[model samples]
Target: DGTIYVGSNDHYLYAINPNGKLKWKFETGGSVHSSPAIGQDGTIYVGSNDHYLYAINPNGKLKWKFETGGSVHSSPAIGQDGTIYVGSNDHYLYAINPNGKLKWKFETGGSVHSSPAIGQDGTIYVGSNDHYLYAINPNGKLKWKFETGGSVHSSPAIGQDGTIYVGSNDHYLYAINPNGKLKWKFETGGSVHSSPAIGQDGTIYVGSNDHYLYAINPNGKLKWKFETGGSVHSSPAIGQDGTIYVGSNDHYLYAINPNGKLKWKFETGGSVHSSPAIGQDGTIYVGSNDHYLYAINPNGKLKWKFETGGSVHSSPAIGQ
Candidate 1:
């Protein structure tokens, strides 16, 4: 059976069926701003603003909760070996074992709001508010750090060729070599809190606060950009047919063609900071500040909507 997992400011993790019916919800100590990551063993890992990372079983029971010094807005990323990596506003990146025990802690000068991206060789790539992206080895030692001009709220995306693409509040999307060297940087008109999504053809899609969704070639050249009515803090998701689905603060989710033309735009009652997740059956799942989780068809029509008690900024995760 397939189920959808999503967090909410209402302080709960919701599990819904394919028909949009709630199966169960687990309460948390505080609002859940982090997205849930499902492990290979059916365990779910998610962080909360209460400064804790919780490991929940498939049956909606709590396995364990690891306390941190600050809010945990950063989502957890599971390593190949089952290690859970997440960041904290307390300025630390924690590596925890599958049993919910802390393995190691690495400190940074500023808060670690950006989620960690694991490399092929088990290295962790993450950003800090100190304006640097860090590469930490599997043994919890620092490999290197790349400095940027502004705080990096944007999470990193690793390309197929091993190139690391990340955004900075300085309004630049950087393409860094696997060896920690800069390949090129594309300038945007505003801060880039949105993460980048890689297309099968090597196109890089990301959003900026300047109200634009950009399509950049792998060579670092601009392919095209689509303007929206408000800032685009939400990241883009690519469909199987190359369609780009992304949200904007202007209260709309726009679907764009592979050639950068607008296919459709769906309106919501509030801003859309939540990223979209496409299901295996081509349904797009996303949330909005309007306090609803919407299931939209691939053609940009609404299939169903589930109202929550509070605004939903958390992204949805689909699993079998």
Candidate 2:
């Protein structure tokens, strides 16, 4: 039962072993469109195009199910209290209990496509198509909201100091204070669909549709920007060496130095839209439209790959 669970457009949740072999697979009513979230106890939580959030056991048994009003393409976040938070195209964010019961639901002005981020104090940070990022308390009460210029589809990343960073289709990356005030905004060449990744030194890295990967200071000043061959919409993942990894529509995953210099590039068969996830051993996991999940080594070598039938846009979450 110890395997990786992958949600695919094939309408199946595939269980893949550590060796990159198929273990088992479960079919959903619709496409398994969201990323899989593994709980502390190994319970797998995933949202599907079927408009349902399904929970399955490590052994592939159905644990429970929660239905939404629309397709759920956004990934899910597990709170400190064992609550699961997810947004739906129905224009609502639902918080459900571990047993699959709805604890609370918050309505937004438009569809919510970004996954939720849980603050250290248990505050829920999420975005909506309505162009606003919201901070909701543990009880589902509104803490505050920050408006953006376009659809807020990028998920917010909380820094060590509680600074919230998010991008919008408005072509800007915003840094908001803990209290929901704007710290600063960094203008990009195109829409900022990539989520920000904050490194240990507070340097934030993100990609933009402008074909550039940018690094900015905590105060929002530009550190550097590296241009790519095509639009960059994938979120960045920072390694322990300050190496930044991000995908581009140009069909390559670039690893760059902290100073914005290119380190190495790994070619994929198709556009890489999914965010990369680093494993404990430094293996990077990402999906491509070419119908495969790749596991690349720390040195940017392909360790293994598993084929899937659909394009992958969902980010992978490493087990805690």
Candidate 3:
């Protein structure tokens, strides 16, 4: 079955059908900024500002909820071993078993709002507000950490060649090899909170607070940059045909061709901090601070929208 699960500032997690109808709604204690992640058993995991990580069953009933010391703005990533990894503003990265038990917690200097990404060899990579990117073993041992001038709000995206690419508020994108050495750093005009997306041919795409979308080469050279009217807090989502779809604070969802040309831009009612998620049939789903979740056609037309009384902070988990 296909279901779209999203969280809102209204303290509810919503499950929507493909036909744009409401399936179910689950209440939480605080605002939910973390996007829901689907487990192998169809359990949905998400974090909330109420300082809890919730595990929900397929029917929208609570399986269990684990408490934390601070807010959980970071999305949870399920490990190959059935461990759920998530970050908290309390300055720790937690590893929890599927049974809702804490396996381990790795302490960091500052808040851990960035999500965790696991490598092929069971290495976990994540960023912290302490201005460092950490690589930890599956057993929770630190491998190495690379520090930047400013804190990292962007999550790491691993390349096919084992290079970990992440952005920092210092206005640069750093590529670190598997051993945690810096490969190269690409500087932008403004802060790079938008995570980089590696294209099929090795072109990296990311957005910046400088109000531009950049396509950088593998060697960290600029391929092109497309100017938007406002900052781009949303990460770029690549479509099946290689088109890049991203949103901006200018209240527009843009479709850019592979060659760095603008295909089209669909205006939303408010700024889009939520990243766009592409469906198998090429439908685009993204949330807006305007209190709606939008579905756009592949050709840049409005398909439908669902009214959520409060702003939708994150998009869908999109279970199949």
Candidate 4:
């Protein structure tokens, strides 16, 4: 029952068999750039530039599809209530029924391009291109929206304490309270487009266009930073050993220690804009502009390589 599902700009979503062979595919009206989110019911949900959100059956069948206000660039997030939330360039955040019906929709000042983060209390946090971080109630009511200096394309990373973290084009990383109040903000040299990854010890890691990866304390203080060759747009994925994995436009994937020290770097033929997803077995999965999906072992050795005809700007998601 093992399979790998990938969405691409080639206008199709592919299902690869356990042996890495093509099993089936589903086509859409436009480019599929969003990463698919696997639901508990074995359904697959993803967005496309065609302004549609699709839910596909486990058998690669189209279950249902929902249209957005504009391009569907944000990834989908699910709540236990069986409601799916997604943002769109149309400037609205939508809550859709599992059956593909619209439940509710929230509007932002500008288009929403960041993925939503659902909290335990049903609070939704997402960023908009209008330079604001928004928090909405479960009923689709705006609770609060904090304005930033520039656009915020980064997704929110929520902590157990109700703290939300996000990056902005203003070159700042922010920490906000559940009540929509600002806690603290840290300025970087360039745009902070990468999403923050929280470790077990409250260390928040994020990459910036400044070509540096930052490690910040829970108190909103900086811990350490690591420099890379080019812009660090890839989000950080933390492994079991506290090793951080991220990619850069410099055409390299780096494995760094928890203290922001580099352990090793692997060079790819093209820019590594796709973020790496770590498996429980310590396998690292990432895509490059060179059109390849690489699976690297814990030792940083290549385990497998699958080539795609188009550039993979989409990130990888692991499923069973």
Candidate 5:
């Protein structure tokens, strides 16, 4: 029952064993750009370009699907109460109950591609092509919205103190307070499409189309910047030892130390768009456009590669 679910652009959501065996795959009406999120009951939630948010049973049957006005490419963010939050290109973010009934919809000025993030106090944060990030209450009411210079295609990451971090096409990463005010912004040479990741020491890591991964301190200063051969669309994953691992469109996954220097790098035949998902026992799993899912021992060598037969755009969703 600890199968990982991955959505592919080929119009199917695969339930795959960690060992690379296909448990089953559920077909969708359109290509799936969203990553799969599992609920407490083993129900998997995902979005499709077909404009639907589907609830698939663990056994690979459909529970229900709620339709939206436009293509749904955002991943589902499940709340503790089983509320599923997702966005669409139709300019609205929908909150649906576990039973697939719509609770409410909040409209943005443009298409919403950013996945939703939930805070401890129950505030939901999301980005939009409208050039702003919206903070909504669980009641579907707007707490506030922070305007950026460009569309926010990247997801928001919340820090320990409710500090929100997000990227924009304007080529800057913004850190916002819970009250929706900008604390600081760090500039990049290109669009910031990768979601920001916060390390235990308050260091924020994010990638840019500028071909570099920048690590910013909590004081809004650039701690360091590591260059890659190509644009880094993949997010950063911090290991227990403060090792920072991220993928690049350059077809490599690099492990950077907390000091922001490269520890090592592993390559695939295609772009490494997927982020690394760490396992309970320290194994790392990452997917590549090369049509393979790689299981790395911990840092370097590949244990094996699973042939998915299609470009795997979505990150692996580890389950138990």
Candidate 6:
């Protein structure tokens, strides 16, 4: 088992080997939709529906557990200084020290399901069901917040120019300037629950409940749209060669070329809402509601599939 981490709806976080054997599992009091974030020192940070963030060591032992007032559906993001930033369903964004102590908490008007992304200058960007995107400083003070037409469940992705790209239930993908000003907003046919992914060429790839995967240029213009049979709640993972890999509720995992043409599509037994993660070997890893984790080759062939007891909504995280 070359270390691999993933959360499950069965209220457990699994550490498995490359060969698909379980090395250990950490039990939580509630379901775990939050993906595990590995710190530099081999500590794993993940949230539970039980309203707590558990810190586990590499040896399959608990280092600490931080309690919150509500369920933590948001995945934790470790800052450069080892600060753990995560959101809670209790309508707050919390900053915790590496030693498992609270640093600060920023309140929002609605639940915070959106994960936080840190900008180059230490700005933390996250969205809320309150229909706003808040930019907070490293010190946990609010820099600014931009209102949207609907709730924002999509996480923010920072571009090379510091632009913040996120989606909202208003059916729009917005590009916000680093200074918290509006750059542009592109409307879609349905709500955007999928987060935006920045391509190497500065393109933005995102999915919509409209059943389309959209490619937008750096200038906020539409490059192309590929329609699927079902809604797309999964985010895209770009390959080194510019290939785009994304999943759809239609039970298909698509590999699209750079020119916006379909390269291939692999059918699964159930809907694929989990985002994909590309391995160093070009293996694309994702999960499905069929209760399995799939390893798909770069060429769009099935490499392997690992079955789970419950639906695998959590994405895969590769580690040493």
lDDT per residue as tens, model 4, 182-283: 999998899999999999998999999999999999998899999999999988999988999999999999999997788988888788888888776788
Order the candidates by lDDT, highest first: 1, 3, 6, 5, 2, 4
lDDT of each: 0.93, 0.87, 0.91, 0.87, 0.90, 0.91
The C-alpha local distance difference test score for the whole of candidate 6 amounts to: 0.91
Clashes of 2: 0
Residue 220, model 3: lDDT of: 90
After superposing candidate 3 on the true structure, give the runs of residues whose Cα lies further than 4 Å from its correct spot.
Answer: none
How does each model score on TM-score? 0.99, 0.97, 0.99, 0.96, 0.97, 0.97
Error of 1 at 302 (Å): 0.8
In candidate 3, how many Å is residue 98 off?
0.7
Stretches of candidate 1 off by over 4 Å are: none
Off by over 4 Å in 4: none
| Candidate 6, position 31, lDDT | 84
Measured with C-alpha atoms, the lDDT of residue 275 in candidate 2 is 85
Across residues 1-320, which tens digit of lDDT does each residue of candidate 3 receive? 77888999999988989889999989999998998999999999999999999999999999999999999999899999899999999999999999999999999999998889989888999999999999999999899999988999898999999999999999998999998888999999999988789999999999999999999999999999999999988989999889999999999999999998999999989998888888878899998989888889999999999988788877566888
Pairs with backbone N, CA or C atoms under 3 Å apart (clashes), candidate 4 = none
* Tens-place lDDT digits, model 6, residues 169-229: 9999999999999999999999999999999999999999999999999888999999999
Candidate 3, residue 149: CA error in Å?
A: 0.8
Q: What 10-residue stretch in candidate 6 is worst by lDDT?
A: 1-10
Report the lDDT of model 3 for residue 243: 97
Whole-model lDDT for model 3 versus the true structure? 0.91
Backbone atom clashes (below 3 Å) for every candidate? 0, 0, 0, 0, 0, 1
Clashing pairs in 3: none
Preferred candidate (lDDT higher): 1 or 4: 1
